[PDB]
Design an enzyme around this catalytic site. Structure first.
Site, PDB file in Angstrom:
ATOM      1  CE  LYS B 129     -15.730  -3.646  -2.795  1.00 39.31           C
ATOM      2  NZ  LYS B 129     -15.704  -4.422  -1.521  1.00 39.31           N
ATOM      3  CE1 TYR B 217     -20.935  -4.548  -3.761  1.00 42.97           C
ATOM      4  CE2 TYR B 217     -19.764  -4.487  -1.660  1.00 42.97           C
ATOM      5  CZ  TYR B 217     -19.946  -5.035  -2.921  1.00 42.97           C
ATOM      6  OH  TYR B 217     -19.136  -6.060  -3.350  1.00 42.97           O
TER       7      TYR B 217
END
Ligand SMILES: NC(=O)C1=CN([C@@H]2O[C@H](COP(=O)(O)OP(=O)(O)OC[C@H]3O[C@@H](n4cnc5c(N)ncnc54)[C@H](OP(=O)(O)O)[C@@H]3O)[C@@H](O)[C@H]2O)C=CC1
Ligand SMILES: NC(=O)C1=CN([C@@H]2O[C@H](COP(=O)(O)OP(=O)(O)OC[C@H]3O[C@@H](n4cnc5c(N)ncnc54)[C@H](OP(=O)(O)O)[C@@H]3O)[C@@H](O)[C@H]2O)C=CC1
Ligand SMILES: NC(=O)C1=CN([C@@H]2O[C@H](COP(=O)(O)OP(=O)(O)OC[C@H]3O[C@@H](n4cnc5c(N)ncnc54)[C@H](OP(=O)(O)O)[C@@H]3O)[C@@H](O)[C@H]2O)C=CC1
Ligand SMILES: NC(=O)C1=CN([C@@H]2O[C@H](COP(=O)(O)OP(=O)(O)OC[C@H]3O[C@@H](n4cnc5c(N)ncnc54)[C@H](OP(=O)(O)O)[C@@H]3O)[C@@H](O)[C@H]2O)C=CC1
Lengths: 382, 381, 383, 382
Positions: B129, B217
């Site tokens: 990511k 996140y």
């Protein structure tokens, strides 16, 4: 006019090699030290074998067990070649393999002495789990054999290589607690006689004792390195439910009190009939240290308390300043050898705990205090 | 009062015993082979070391642009030296059947090209990511995965972290009641001298600042904790104009979101403040505090009500679930082996990129951006 | 040699005998010089303030002002207040005739703060007024003007300005224990219950002045300000409330606001009427992060300074009480200010600043655009 | 088409009377029960007098002091009629004041019995601080006098009226810990001889003992109400630096362990030379309870621990479900007399502790175990 620093501006926008990254955890280095793990039991397969991965100088060279089927399965999981699988009969043959620098004895307490001694005769270093043995004499015979073979003897005291326990000892030595005066320890865990690993622990001949020998030894040893000194006398008491089949031969719960030359006192206990407990308390006249968990395989947590404050310390959430206790324990022997240095947990250390555990057992049996001021000296410190 | 039979039957002499009780994930096999691309900070500190704890995965090859480093790393992990590729011959992995999948651990802007080249090489793809630096690139990565009939998985370790999964579980069990307010914060001091951080300060390589790097996140977390998608976002960003680190990417950015259920959330990411990873989920019955929320280790969650704080963390002696890194690796392996979709598919990674793009637009224009585009989380959160 | 007992111990009589004043481990009562007239015997007055007088070192309850004679009579008896010292809202102004009434403490619905504060000053009394100060910026100014005209002090009820743990948080920040401050986060929530008499006026915009922001979000707002030790120069906000929920027909349930400060620091916070108890503040610096949780509780506040591998917590001790509770401290503070001819830490200007900021936040939420708040407020005496 | 609820819509926009508000903390009710406080010392002025404010049925009616000047200062601080100030000589005249329902003896240990008995002869109920007395015989004399005057005798065990301690007893009885097997206690605090209050504490004649009588009793008494049973035998040891002027007559540190009829064991200690410690641990086979702070004046905190979990409880941050232990303790006697009920902490409860402490000292002195199976039954439960 604010501009990007040189480093950032020099980064190519196309695929390109880059330097070695910053390390935030212990990086693998080499695998020069080869171990021969003896006894593929609960601790060996759950903690020790998996613990080699993080090592920076150690590797698994051979396996030793009486269950070939298992040994084969465990060998395939760790790339160990089938040819280096020894049984308890041919064990002494490890002598013909120079790639086996040392042996790690993870067998029942009663079988530590003999295999350690056989290992030295095979000209190998010995990593022996605790408790050292089931008798002081055997510990001495283990030590003599070590000297005779001119090899190193190290006892599996993982806590002597646990980051949080090390931090605890450090703050104590830095006098953050002030004058030490009272240590409290508790180590417990519900005994399950159906667990293959626990079955020999219920046998006096195989275990050498009850909870003290198995887990109480953590509070005993911890009191010693946290305080940085040795007990001069001990008193104890033990009780086990007479109708509980688990304790027909070994004790369930036992409590021991000790006095040190500095004037410091301590009271601790171990239990086979109560759920998970691992708590150490060190009271000084400036502050009080609480280690809870104190000696876990993971998630240790310590706190220095004063009125209105609780300063906790634990392993970071992103970085790893020090290696885990298992991997660190394995490499500590490897390093002690290649560097010609003494080990932090020598055979003499493990023998001290056995002698102490016998003085404690004797104190509980006789109900009288047992002098332990026999001048033991911790080489290299705690 | 007699000793149990089991205890009594244990020999006094050395003898073989049965397989011990397992109190942590035991190794099982190494059937899924990975080709790791990019020997950087995340690869060497967390990923490679994470293979040891796997139960179905192994390191088969390495792909690097630094020959000397590749040799050193290969030797440390017993990787066949002839199985070290560079960015030019990367495509030849197609010839090695022992290479089941690739793991892209390169700068954000290079994810797409190496993912697509990997699919053409007939390999499964694990990609870090944020998925890519454009929505279009995410889609192309997905089109390529389908053409090759291979799986595409994004590196959302938190989707395989015990504590995070425990957090999702109690929320779904309604222990917090009706969800109404989520708060997130993800921060860490940007050190431009750290080689790994250097490309993060470049817009072309990073695709954005703290949001693309760590704010994701909080974004991703808000989504799986609430178990729904945002339908509207607003945001604002600010960076010290005199700080050389943020000439191209944002330091601090704050985003607010609204969900169809009526729940709201406010979160931020920062490159100029110390370590922060904290999530808060307010319900009308209880409040959940995850702190640390998304750490590599030591996560800790707490359900709070007046007079109580029930904390949960990993045990001190047992390990009921594998670490996020090993679990993440095995998850792709098992998905392939068992013919199942992955929990973190390319579509999930793309959703975040689209949302991050929407958040940047909101901060840029200062207006709310509609995100009610009907994304569906396949297999749940 | 051989030890002997110290003189102090050896000199203690073995028979019943008087001893000296003991060591103090908590704030000792001292006097009851400053007399208060409490206005509005509601939830806060009866649960926290009246009981808070016992721990004061210079304050006392002299009179009561209530519109429920049945209730005032009962409360007056519980606190030994002279039955003749009970006023209603009509004969309120007569407190001017009682010299033993030094000040009034207005604990009425927000929309009624201004008029009673003003009537009090005209009655020649000092004034302690609960937050939020008033329901309009103009009314706040009218209160300040009346205070100046009467030459009396005006103090707003920001208990957290006299709470030990909040002061400890402010202190470590000023000592630079967190490094340069860059991101503050706040959350203040509690489930709104319309069947609670005290909450009923809070659902009426005319009486409340606003929703969750005015009631409890103000703690996050005010807290961000004294924790950073500076004022915001611009704010942006958004609010949302279930359109079918009868509690939020006139006031907002949930509102989120983010601000920027002149130092460059940022903050994002929210208040909520539909989620359970939350009082949490976090201050991120480049050296450490502070977590206050509980942040603004009536009791049991807890703070922690976090860095990788550490969490240093602080809370009130278990056997000693180094500082007085926030309620008693707040009350005594005005008393001491009057007696020592000093300004109060929470003056009318402080309360007005929050009301101006809240109006700016509502404005930003309404227009969906940022609002400039760089109007030059200066904190007299520090935060 | 949402509309405001009736309650909200009916609120006047102009100043108007409103109902009694919701109660989120104990509300004052009456001041019917009058106390005469004996001994204006450290505990009296720091905890007890200030504790009357939060009472729902108790008030201070008179003061008894040997320091007339201090008494008048304190009298004025609490609105006590100057005429209601007695000294140790005319103490008996309280019998002439019907407004004085009871006395609260907050004097040195050795003077408890004396004044309690004089109070009973004065026809007053008696609240007496712990330890009850400095001799078992004196404890019985106080009880006899209580029965003779048909008045109640209550010992100041604040922890028997502390919310967190009560919560801890409740969860244990609910079996959240499983079968109880090991209890650990520690109560410590640095002794300062310059503190006027600590000066009589160093005198054996006035104190009756060292740290055990002063603070160890919390661990002792706590072990009993947490286990909900009585010890059948005790063992102990004590040590004090021989050169420290503080411990010439009374003990510094003492460690005691006990066995209960259920099989449960315990090991605790008290210390005068280490900083603030109040920690109780109760291990069962299902969970472990940690109370820390265990018996603080404020901020108690309890936590039930199991692998991977730590469920903590403490007083709420906005509401106060139960009254503080001090006010509660004071009101408890008031309610008992008014409702014609026994008190949770009767003279017999304080006497049990004194007898057990005597047995612990005896066990420390002889180094032998002392049988304490004398049949004490907790009337009304723990
Ligand atoms: N430091 C620490 O943290 C810990 C240390 N230990 C120590 O490790 C040692 C092993 O204990 P643990 O792994 O828990 O126990 P296990 O019962 O699970 O294993 C004992 C091992 O020794 C071998 N063995 C040889 N003879 C016998 C015998 N007669 N009975 C049983 N086993 C035999 C077996 O190997 P095989 O079947 O393959 O032939 C078996 O795997 C002990 O000394 C213990 O004190 C244990 C836990 C933690
Ligand atoms: N999920 C998680 O917890 C984390 C995910 N990440 C992600 O992993 C990816 C890599 O980040 P990270 O390891 O921290 O960073 P690094 O800078 O340390 O490494 C990037 C690696 O990719 C290769 N590379 C190829 N071209 C370039 C280029 N032009 N510039 C820089 N590197 C190049 C290099 O490998 P070589 O030298 O061998 O050629 C280099 O080591 C990112 O997408 C990041 O978001 C990062 C940290 C944590
Ligand atoms: N700083 C803090 O921690 C807190 C501050 N507060 C503040 O205190 C003030 C009062 O709030 P609170 O006690 O909770 O609320 P309540 O509704 O419980 O009480 C308000 C009181 O003011 C009087 N009053 C006069 N006119 C009205 C009217 N028209 N409608 C309602 N009440 C009226 C009443 O007293 P009487 O019947 O005797 O005439 C009533 O009991 C508010 O400004 C609030 O913001 C509230 C909680 C905490
Ligand atoms: N439950 C709890 O939490 C606590 C209970 N206590 C108990 O309260 C009792 C009093 O202790 P504490 O207040 O700390 O101690 P102090 O020494 O401070 O006070 C004792 C008081 O009793 C009177 N007194 C009469 N004769 C003597 C004498 N010969 N020597 C000393 N004092 C005398 C004095 O009152 P005056 O000057 O007015 O004449 C003095 O102030 C003890 O039994 C102690 O165990 C103590 C602390 C906590």
């Amino acid at each position: 006019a604010a501009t990007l620093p040189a480093g950032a501006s020099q980064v190519p926008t196309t695929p390109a090699g880059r330097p070695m990254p910053y390390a935030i955890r212990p990086m693998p280095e080499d695998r020069r030290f080869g171990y021969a793990i003896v006894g593929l039991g609960k601790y060996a397969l759950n903690q020790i074998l998996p613990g080699f991965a993080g090592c920076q100088h150690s590797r698994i060279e051979a396996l030793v067990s009486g269950n070939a089927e298992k040994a084969k399965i465990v060998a395939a999981e760790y790339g160990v070649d089938p040819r280096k699988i020894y049984d308890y009969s041919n064990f002494d043959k490890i002598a013909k393999d120079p790639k086996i620098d040392a042996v790690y004895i993870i067998l029942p307490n009663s079988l530590h002495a003999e295999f350690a001694i056989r290992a030295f005769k095979a000209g190998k270093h010995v990593m022996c789990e605790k408790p050292m043995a089931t008798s002081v004499a055997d510990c001495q015979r283990m030590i003599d054999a070590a000297k005779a073979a001119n090899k190193k003897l190290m006892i599996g005291y993982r806590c002597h290589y646990d980051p949080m326990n090390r931090a605890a000892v450090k703050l104590i030595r830095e006098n953050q607690l002030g004058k030490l005066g009272m240590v409290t320890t508790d180590n417990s865990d519900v005994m399950d006689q159906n667990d293959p690993a626990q079955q020999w622990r219920l046998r006096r001949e195989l275990a050498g004792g009850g909870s003290l020998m198995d887990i109480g030894i953590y509070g005993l040893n911890g009191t010693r390195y946290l305080l940085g000194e040795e007990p001069i006398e001990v008193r104890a008491y033990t009780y086990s439910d007479p109708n509980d089949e688990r304790f027909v031969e070994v004790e369930d719960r036992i409590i021991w009190q000790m006095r040190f030359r500095s004037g410091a006192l301590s009271h601790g206990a171990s239990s086979y009939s109560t759920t998970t407990t691992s708590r150490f308390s060190v009271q000084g006249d400036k502050a009080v240290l609480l280690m809870d968990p104190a000696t876990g395989y993971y998630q240790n947590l310590i706190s220095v308390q004063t009125p209105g404050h609780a300063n906790q310390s634990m392993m970071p959430q992103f970085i790893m300043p020090a290696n885990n206790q298992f991997s660190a324990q394995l490499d500590h022997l490897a390093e002690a050898v290649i560097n010609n240095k003494p080990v932090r947990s020598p055979g003499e250390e493990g023998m001290q705990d056995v002698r102490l555990i016998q003085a404690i057992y004797e104190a509980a049996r006789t109900g009288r205090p047992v002098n332990t001021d026999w001048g033991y000296v911790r080489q290299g410190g705690y």
